[PDB]
Amino acid sequence: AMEQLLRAELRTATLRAFGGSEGRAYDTDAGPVFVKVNRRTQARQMFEGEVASLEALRSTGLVRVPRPMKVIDLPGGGAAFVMEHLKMKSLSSQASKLGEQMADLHLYNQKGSSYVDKFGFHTVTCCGFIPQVNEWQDDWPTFFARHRLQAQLDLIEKDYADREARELWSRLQVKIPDLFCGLEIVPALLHGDLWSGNVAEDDVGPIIYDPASFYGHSEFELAIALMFGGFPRSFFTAYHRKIPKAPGFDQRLLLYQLFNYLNHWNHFGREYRSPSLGTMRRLLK
Amino acid sequence: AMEQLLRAELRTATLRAFGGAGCISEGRAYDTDAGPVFVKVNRRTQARQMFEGEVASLEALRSTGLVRVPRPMKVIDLPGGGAAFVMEHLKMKSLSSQASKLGEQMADLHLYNQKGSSYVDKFGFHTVTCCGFIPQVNEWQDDWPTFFARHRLQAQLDLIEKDYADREARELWSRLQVKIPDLFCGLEIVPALLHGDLWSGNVAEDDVGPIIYDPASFYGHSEFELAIALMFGGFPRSFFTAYHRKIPKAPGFDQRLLLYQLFNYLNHWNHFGREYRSPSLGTMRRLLK
Numbered sequence: 001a002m003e004q005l006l007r008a009e010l011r012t013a014t015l016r017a018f019g020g021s022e023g024r025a026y027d028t029d030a031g032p033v034f035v036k037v038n039r040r041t042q043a044r045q046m047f048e049g050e051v052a053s054l055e056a057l058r059s060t061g062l063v064r065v066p067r068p069m070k071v072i073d074l075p076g077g078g079a080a081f082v083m084e085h086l087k088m089k090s091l092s093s094q095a096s097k098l099g100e101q102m103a104d105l106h107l108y109n110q111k112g113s114s115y116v117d118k119f120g121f122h123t124v125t126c127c128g129f130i131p132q133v134n135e136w137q138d139d140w141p142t143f144f145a146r147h148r149l150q151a152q153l154d155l156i157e158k159d160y161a162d163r164e165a166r167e168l169w170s171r172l173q174v175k176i177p178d179l180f181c182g183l184e185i186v187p188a189l190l191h192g193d194l195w196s197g198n199v200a201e202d203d204v205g206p207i208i209y210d211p212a213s214f215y216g217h218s219e220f221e222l223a224i225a226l227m228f229g230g231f232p233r234s235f236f237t238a239y240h241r242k243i244p245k246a247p248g249f250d251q252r253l254l255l256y257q258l259f260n261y262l263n264h265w266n267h268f269g270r271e272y273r274s275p276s277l278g279t280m281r282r283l284l285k
Numbered sequence: 286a287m288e289q290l291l292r293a294e295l296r297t298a299t300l301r302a303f304g305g306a307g308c309i310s311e312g313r314a315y316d317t318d319a320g321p322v323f324v325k326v327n328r329r330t331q332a333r334q335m336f337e338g339e340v341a342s343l344e345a346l347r348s349t350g351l352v353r354v355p356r357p358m359k360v361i362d363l364p365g366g367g368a369a370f371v372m373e374h375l376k377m378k379s380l381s382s383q384a385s386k387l388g389e390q391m392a393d394l395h396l397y398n399q400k401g402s403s404y405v406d407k408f409g410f411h412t413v414t415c416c417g418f419i420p421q422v423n424e425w426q427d428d429w430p431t432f433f434a435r436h437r438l439q440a441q442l443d444l445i446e447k448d449y450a451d452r453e454a455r456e457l458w459s460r461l462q463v464k465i466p467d468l469f470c471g472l473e474i475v476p477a478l479l480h481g482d483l484w485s486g487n488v489a490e491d492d493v494g495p496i497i498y499d500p501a502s503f504y505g506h507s508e509f510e511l512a513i514a515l516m517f518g519g520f521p522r523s524f525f526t527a528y529h530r531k532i533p534k535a536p537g538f539d540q541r542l543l544l545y546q547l548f549n550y551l552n553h554w555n556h557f558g559r560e561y562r563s564p565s566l567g568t569m570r571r572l573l574k
């Protein structure tokens with residue numbers, strides 16, 4: 001592996017690791033803090049959605065997230081978001097614990113005393129830089145098609161005028177209910193952006209951060225985790241011991257990954273055109 | 286400054302910036318038989334080219350003897366793609382007390398080509414150096430505005446056209462191209478060896494003085510160095526005071542600062558996505574106003 005190659009190339013018996021958007025940590029009097037800085041006009045709205053997501057996750061008591069402290073308007077535009085600092089390392093030893101916690105998080109709404117009975121959220125939350133509509137909907141395929149897939153494809157039409165995306169979406173949209181028939185879908189509180197880069201751990205347990213939360217189908221959470229990798233297998237094993245894969249899981253997984261590919265096309269451009277269209281074609285085959 | 290706002294908003298006396306790591310590569314320190322090393326890993330196809338550019342930049346800076354940077358040690362091809370770059374490990378903290386000293390050293394670095402036994406009378410570099418992930422053309426050119434428009438701004442905007450097909454960026458650039466020579470005020474520009482990526486995250490200090498690292502060097506206009514230092518903050522005022530005592534601002538500095546910041550906004554648009562479209566277009570509009 002890496003370590004072995006370095007030992008060989010450097011000719012050393014020992015090789016002992018040490019030392020572990022404009023985000024800077026700062027030592028502070030009342031304990032350490034971490035400050036995220038974003039200079040664009042919408043930064044406050046984005047950070048308030050992040051605060052709202054962190055607060056919703058914190059209210060469950062099921063997952064460890066950084067405590068939000070303050071959102072500060074910046075002279076010259078944008079905002080800083082100050083939060084509790086956490087010493088973190090890549091998720092490894094705590095992967096199975098995090099799988100358990102994430103499954104409990106997804107079950108929390110249906111199992112509690114204050115049931116949220118629609119898909120969506122009480123405020124706007126941003127997946128990356130793009131604001132999302134979270135308007136409450138009774139029906140999950142309606143919510144996902146309109147306020148996730150259609151929203152992304154409207155931006156693609158406006159900014160790229162992509163004929164293939166338009167034609168494939170015209171065909172795919174009618175097929176979506178086939179992936180949901182005969183199944184009970186319960187709103188589940190989601191982290192909303194559970195890429196491997198947004199999870200970590202300390203000596204006590206796993207930590208998750210940078211949420212973009214809403215009430216959705218639990219399975220949507222896992223799509224970004226699987227597509228970009230980074231999670232130990234034991235994360236998924238632990239998760240699916242509590243929430244087993246429902247029938248049709250692999251086909252819905254493509255639909256949910258499609259959303260993430262479209263969001264990456266809108267964020268980063270045409271490098272993501274091929275996976276977006278290819279995923280749509282796989283769904284149509 | 287952000288520090289002052291944070292001290293006020295949070296009500297704290299002290300506030301010291303601290304701290305895998307980096308936005309381009311995975312960075313890790315290891316103790317070894319011969320001492321500590323710092324290792325950067327990048328899994329993309331172009332990683333070797335990227336690190337070889339960094340090695341050439343570190344070597345050029347080290348040859349001046351005017352600044353302290355890590356010694357490059359090895360570039361290693363990885364099974365499965367990409368490369369690892371091993372370099373001297375340096376115990377470091379955020380730049381603070383050593384900022385005025387760094388301003389002096391950076392001005393001396395820029396002045397070295399004119400005052401020392403250096404003879405580079407064109408802009409560019411002897412090898413490819415990468416802006417982050419993006420390979421740059423460093424073809425030598427006698428004229429700096431030509432080099433910068435062709436091998437820095439046009440290169441970034443061609444990538445924006447390929448990946449984003451952004452009409453507004455295309456149309457503003459055609460207009461800005463016509464304006465560029467006016468921004469130079471008839472000045473004779475002298476080639477200066479640049480670090481090339483002097484944002485506050487690429488400078489630091491120890492008890493001997495300041496340290497800089499992660500260069501992407503070339504012979505350019507000295508002023509270009511400061512643009513990224515200014516736009517992302519993090520340098521004490523005394524860095525700039527010390528620097529400009531040695532190299533005063535030439536006429537038109539303030540407008541060229543916008544041109545050079547534009548390059549960095551475009552590069553951040555290409556690296557990090559559409560969050561950087563608004564400052565890129567806004568900067569072009571301000572220059573056209």
Ligand SMILES: Nc1ncnc2c1ncn2[C@@H]1O[C@H](COP(=O)(O)OP(=O)(O)OP(=O)(O)O)[C@@H](O)[C@H]1O
Nearest residue numbers: 304306307308309310312323355373374375498499
């Ligand atoms: N030689 C070194 N010794 C010790 N620590 C180092 C060394 N070089 C870099 N570091 C640390 O690693 C961090 C990342 O390094 P570097 O900036 O070279 O990486 P990068 O991935 O190219 O980052 P970016 O291009 O976003 O600045 C630095 O901010 C510093 O904290």
Ligand SMILES: Nc1ncnc2c1ncn2[C@@H]1O[C@H](COP(=O)(O)OP(=O)(O)O)[C@@H](O)[C@H]1O
Nearest residue numbers: 021023034066083084085086087197198209210
């Ligand atoms: N509360 C925190 N404490 C310490 N480090 C943090 C904290 N939040 C984030 N980080 C560090 O910053 C990195 C990016 O955080 P993230 O919230 O994903 O930022 P962004 O939304 O700008 O990408 C993380 O990978 C982690 O190393």
Ligand SMILES: O=C(CN1CCOCC1)[C@@H](O)[C@H](O)[C@H](O)CO
Nearest residue numbers: 022308416417482484517552556
């Ligand atoms: O990553 C870099 C600069 N950063 C400054 C503001 O915070 C995020 C990026 C550069 O160091 C790199 O070489 C490349 O240009 C991509 O920026």
